[PDB]
Amino acid sequence: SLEQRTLNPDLFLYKELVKAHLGERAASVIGMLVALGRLSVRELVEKIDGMDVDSVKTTLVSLTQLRCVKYLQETAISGKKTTYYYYNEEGIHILLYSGLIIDEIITQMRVNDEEEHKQLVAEIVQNVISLGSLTVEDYLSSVTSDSMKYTISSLFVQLCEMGYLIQISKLHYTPIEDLWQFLYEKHYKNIPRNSPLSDLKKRSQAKMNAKTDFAKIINKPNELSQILTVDPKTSLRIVKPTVSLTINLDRFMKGRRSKQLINLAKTRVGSVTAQVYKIALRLTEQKSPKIRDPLTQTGLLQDLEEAKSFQDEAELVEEKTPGLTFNAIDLARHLPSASLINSHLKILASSNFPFLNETKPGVYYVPYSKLMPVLKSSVYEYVIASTLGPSAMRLSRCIRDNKLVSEKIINSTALMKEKDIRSTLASLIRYNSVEIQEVPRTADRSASRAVFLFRCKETHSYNFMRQNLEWNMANLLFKKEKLKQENSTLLKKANRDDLLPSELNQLKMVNERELNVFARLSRLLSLWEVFQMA
Amino acid sequence: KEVVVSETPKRIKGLEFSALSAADIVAQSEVEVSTRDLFDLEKDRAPKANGALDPKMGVSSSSLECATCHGNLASCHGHFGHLKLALPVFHIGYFKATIQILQGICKNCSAILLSETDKRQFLHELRRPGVDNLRRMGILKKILDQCKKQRRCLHCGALNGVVKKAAALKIIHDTFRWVGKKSAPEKDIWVGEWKEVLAHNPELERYVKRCMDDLNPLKTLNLFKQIKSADCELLGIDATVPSGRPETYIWRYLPAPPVCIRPSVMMQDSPASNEDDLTVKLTEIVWTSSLIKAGLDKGISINNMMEHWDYLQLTVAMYINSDSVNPKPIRGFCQRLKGKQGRFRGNLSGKRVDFSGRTVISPDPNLSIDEVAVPDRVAKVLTYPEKVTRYNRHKLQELIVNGPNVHPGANYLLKRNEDARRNLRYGDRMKLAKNLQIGDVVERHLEDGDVVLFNRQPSLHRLSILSHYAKIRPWRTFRLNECVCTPYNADFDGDEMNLHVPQTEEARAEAINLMG
Amino acid sequence: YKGEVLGITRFGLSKMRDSVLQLASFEKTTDHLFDAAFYMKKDAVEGVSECIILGQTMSIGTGSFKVVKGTNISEKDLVPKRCLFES
Amino acid sequence: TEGRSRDGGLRLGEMERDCVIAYGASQLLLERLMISSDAFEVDVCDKCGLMGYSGWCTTCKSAENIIKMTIPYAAKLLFQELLSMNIAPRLRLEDIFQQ
Amino acid sequence: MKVLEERNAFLSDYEVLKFLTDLEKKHLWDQKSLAPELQGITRNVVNYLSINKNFMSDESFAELMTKLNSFKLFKAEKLQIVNQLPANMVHLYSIVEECDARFDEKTIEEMLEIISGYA
Amino acid sequence: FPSIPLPINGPITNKERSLAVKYINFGKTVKDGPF
Amino acid sequence: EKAIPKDQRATTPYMTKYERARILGTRALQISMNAPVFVDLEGETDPLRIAMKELAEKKIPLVIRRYLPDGSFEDWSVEELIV
Amino acid sequence: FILSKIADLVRIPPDQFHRDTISAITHQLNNKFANKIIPNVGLCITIYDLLTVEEGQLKPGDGSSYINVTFRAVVFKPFLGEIVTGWISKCTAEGIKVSLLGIFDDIFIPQNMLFEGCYYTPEESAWIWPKLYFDVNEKIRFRIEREVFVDVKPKSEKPPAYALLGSCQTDGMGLVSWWE
Amino acid sequence: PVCKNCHGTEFERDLSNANNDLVCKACGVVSEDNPIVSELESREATLNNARRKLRAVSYALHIPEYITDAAFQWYKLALANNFVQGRRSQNVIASCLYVACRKEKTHHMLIDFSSR
Ligand SMILES: [Zn+2]
Ligand SMILES: [Zn+2]
Ligand SMILES: [Zn+2]
Ligand SMILES: [Zn+2]
């Protein structure tokens, strides 16, 4: 399969997601936007061929409903209004994490047991977004007229006010940079001429006004003050029925981050304190620091006097946020013993891994900005010990703390024989955990008259890992659809009935093996999502 | 089967260029040349095991057989092989075209040194229908200067200086550009990183300023592997094509050309063949990449294997172009495609033709203008193909019985069912003369009235070539009339020229009415 | 005719007409082909020095027009023989 | 082969080549440069268009979209030697007729 | 080579012999010269189809066929019953579907005498 | 033909076996639905 | 972009040098391909010489299609031009 | 017995200039299309007529006149349930080699819609019947379900070009003399 | 080697008119047209030294080189037949010289070897 292993960036991942479960005609057009960047319809039809101009719009409305693209309108002084169309990178991640949301509703809503909406609440996620958008009038107007709909309608305000059901708007459907320009030009046209002093600061006068506007306008959909209708009759509280809403990835990805952190605890403590840590981890999940950092996405990240300000205030926000600094007193009532609440938390500060390490005395909270870099350094070194030799695990840590290691001190600091490390180091240049630094002791940088120095380079090592896993995801996805190509005449017969006795065998052996594909992918996708905390 | 076949003749609208991927190299190759030595010690006539002038790679002799397509020497059109490097090196031809595209990207996040709204302006000058190569390469000068006038990237803020050559054939990135602001985190870690090795062997203190980060082909390939497809159009590369990655612009794999391009010429100074320089440079390639592959696997010194891989870096940088030897020099691909009459002038623009003859020229008044007098001995050498019709049937039936011994006869024939030719001096002629299927072509000698052109070797202007009629004459020289010497500026002082004859019917007419 | 003074040199032919296999016939060959194959260019073949390398009909001189044979026929005998379609 | 003892065949060079276009003759220019000298028949593939051998494509191995035509042999070796390094001469065809 | 319409029209099997007998006519005295590859194939079309009809006027063929296609919309079977077991209705039971529960009148006897009268 | 596998090679557990059924019906709603 | 009839026939009425060299080149090889002649030939060989004689009575059964450089057709029967 | 409007280009050698326009176009299209299968269409036997003809263009290297022309030809495409009263000249032990004599013999049709007492007897019979037998060179009724058209050439007889699907599901199937 | 019409086994290259075609005399059909003219290591090292030693005294005794070249194969077979091991290297090759000296029937004696 050397054809596939060469020419494939993350475009081979992104093209095949709509090729997996959608019509075929949209896999062609989604590859065009990722390869070309941004383009409207008036130049789209020149790029593709085999799709009519309205058949583009017939195709474009399919991933429009599923929020898989994001548009932008810009008009010219001389020309008409031009609708530049971009790609949505998170709306297609919903198709990636599609099954995992169903296992998130159950493992986070544990107040109910043996309920008669277990089959139903697993279907609401299949109802809210497989249709695309969703409003309240869509499911009440189903085949069930009442069937105790008021119980079901009151069930979702329990399911919406916990999060990840934010009302959609233009903000969810427009990207992050094409909003910021005309609002910065709005603040810039708020400051006219007749202030000539410090004009370099007057250019930044709109920029200080843009920072407060950016946090304000991003909280407008997160503002829960208008997502509810206080009903004086036949109910007590209800969401507004005229709200079009889908899922939000933000609380899920923070919630998926929350499951990732406790797996370090089960390695770094036993079964008691990991159970103690699991409960208090849950309470801070609904209000947590943002994983994607929309401030740092695209903007003034090139200058360090601004690039420092993206974590100077963000540490002060995480430190001075009221909705996570627990008193370590309310933890005993949530566990199904305030001394043991303090004594089993004492091990969390004693370890050199900064979770529950720094705090004000009497109050306790878990830090975020200085914790997620330790988790990324921890798992990959274990992956080196997992898929290849543990001698590299010794060598990866030796070059880690010892900056600019030489070939003499590597046998002074680490203690192995000479022939084995050549059989271990040389695979790490190939996989880019170590790098080369050269000292020219002769003229014109002679290769033989030079000794070579090493480095960890904690950025390039993880970039190689990401595209190594993005390909391995789509490689297993490539082996999904090709198995459905053969033996298709009886899968068509397996979908026309809702019986040859020997033909049924060739449907189960192909079905048990694809069952292993989703399980290994779920094991694989958790290892990759550790490194989107950027 | 009972099955129809139909295909139109076609034309060429225009060639276009590309560099194919490293997955295309093995896609068109069929043999592999892992082993080194060309001639096995079996002492056979064609001892070639795997890694040599392989008989199903092609054929370089008349006594052998190409085992792939088929044939001895004419049926074989040659077949390609491939190599597999132990670790990739740069491309010597794209060495200029890989350092210009390195100055634009970041060195840490590997993103183009531009802002978002800035790069949206630049590609707008690409989308209009009026773009020439004059202004395509013109506006690409501006896109590189803006990245070179931009110190710190956008995704991680990493400072980037300049990258240029190290004058072997390797490049270095001068990453440090401070004016007076030494308070940078990278520089403070840099002196914090460097101080650990200063404790040991501190004689390298005079080498600290010259010390600098390098970019070998193994770092740069993964550097080129991270950069995305959406922004390729800003720096020369187009998307939507399979080989549209920049990863295929340095040598990772190398194809082996057929042996028709590198023929095993036998000089006949010995029973051994003088094997050309094309194979033995390729032989040192597969031998060097073998020991580097086995060297790191067994485990050898880094300082030992790095000069081997640098020797192999110079090795591929000579197989294509031997200008970079930096010293009887070896001939290369570039060293034969250009030059005075290497190619393109003595092989493409000016070729060598059949059906010609060069003797001296001689004056004669008695013959007319528009006609050259033809010596008879070359008249029974140079021929002309003549198709049979009912109009010329009686004449050609008389002509074929003359044979190649009297002048108005034939030398060869080609029947409509015959495939190659048939000789006339062997076999009976008159019994063969009686058949003469009308649908064929005969090969008669020259005669009076035919269309022959004539040239001067110093071609000053277009009237140095003129087409004439003929008349066969029993002497041994070229007789020409007195007037025509002026455009040929000839002098009959011992010089000589050749004459040419076309062998179609549309050129037999075209030469009279344009250069008569 | 292109807006500027320009020689008949290497510098003067890099801006006058750009056609990469014709430029291969000039002095510097290799420097004109790599950057072209790096840019993956596309030139149609219409040059008189271009048609001779590939060996097709040169478009200049007596090769501009093309020759047509008259078919000396009309629609008076080009009627269909269609009959008894469905009854 | 150049050489009187090498049984001759003389070089019609480039300085003589330009004078033929100065007459505008377009067929013996084609005839005396590949028909009388260097005629050679190559079958070429249409899509991802490169040459193949006797009846094969060997780059999309179906051997169906094959076009019978002819070129100079000196042109046949030309785009084979540039294929030895990383250059792909992607060939594009049209029909002669139906303007 | 471009196929514009694959199923341009329909033609009866009478013109399969009618036009082709004219092509057998101006054909250097076929079948009686006993005292290319195509001419054997075209004659194999002539002899095989005519024997099944034998073992005539097209105006007589049009009158009976106009009475045959009395269907509302699904008529296309009216052309295929011209030389497929004439004078037999148990074969017409196997030709066209759902006519055993639709033709239960004197139509199938009226169609019988048309088909039997053709032979 | 290539060596060095990843260490995630396991029989599917019932904790994630029902999780894999949530995928095959998900695309069945989409493909057999409107699109 | 299409056929242009005799109303918009706005080029020379004259058989040029390149025309008369082209029609003789395309005629004489058809004579070698056993095409039937149109002129009262005598005992005669060299199918070019019978072809140049056929030009004298304008008995060529051909027609020339001049292309305009905007991709426009223009037809000219071989009898219509004079020389 | 049905028409198929197609387009194609045609050539002529210059020695057929004595013949008029159409009759040479007929001749040169015959031997190109005489008893020839079409890719994924069928087997046109004879050119029916000519729809429209264009003007003869010339290759400059050839000198002949080449003409593109659109027309339809006659091709038999019976039906997907058509009764055919064909013959046979071959029997094999896994199906039945029902082939219409005279025209084409590339047909193997199975018996996949019949009863459960069907096998092969090597005693001149198809199988033993629970019923006048049938043999070669006689009118045998058989119909058509499907067809398979492939156009592959795997270079490195069973012609896979024109193959039909047939069965004998109802009574009277195997000989026309069982009825009438 | 075999014709396509007469299947003859005799082919005759005609150079009468400088075409150099290949043709049989039986029927006269050409065979081909346009002719295409042609325009251990320790075991290796122990003969590379032995090559020097054969060349040494051949320069001393004026031995012409078609003996020294011929004598190397006499040394080559006895190299394979285990004649070299144990015995002195200088002694064995001088005996190998006189074999070819005798086979070529020269004036060279045997004590001219041993005196040097
Ligand atoms: Zn071969
Ligand atoms: Zn960066
Ligand atoms: Zn191809
Ligand atoms: Zn012979």
CSV table of N, CA and C in Angstrom, one decimal, chain B residues 204 211 493:
chain,number,residue,atom,x,y,z
B,204,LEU,N,37.1,24.8,23.0
B,204,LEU,CA,36.2,25.2,21.9
B,204,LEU,C,35.6,26.6,22.1
B,211,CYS,N,29.9,28.5,15.7
B,211,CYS,CA,28.9,27.4,15.9
B,211,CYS,C,27.5,28.0,15.6
B,493,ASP,N,38.1,25.9,-56.5
B,493,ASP,CA,39.6,25.8,-56.2
B,493,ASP,C,39.9,24.6,-55.4
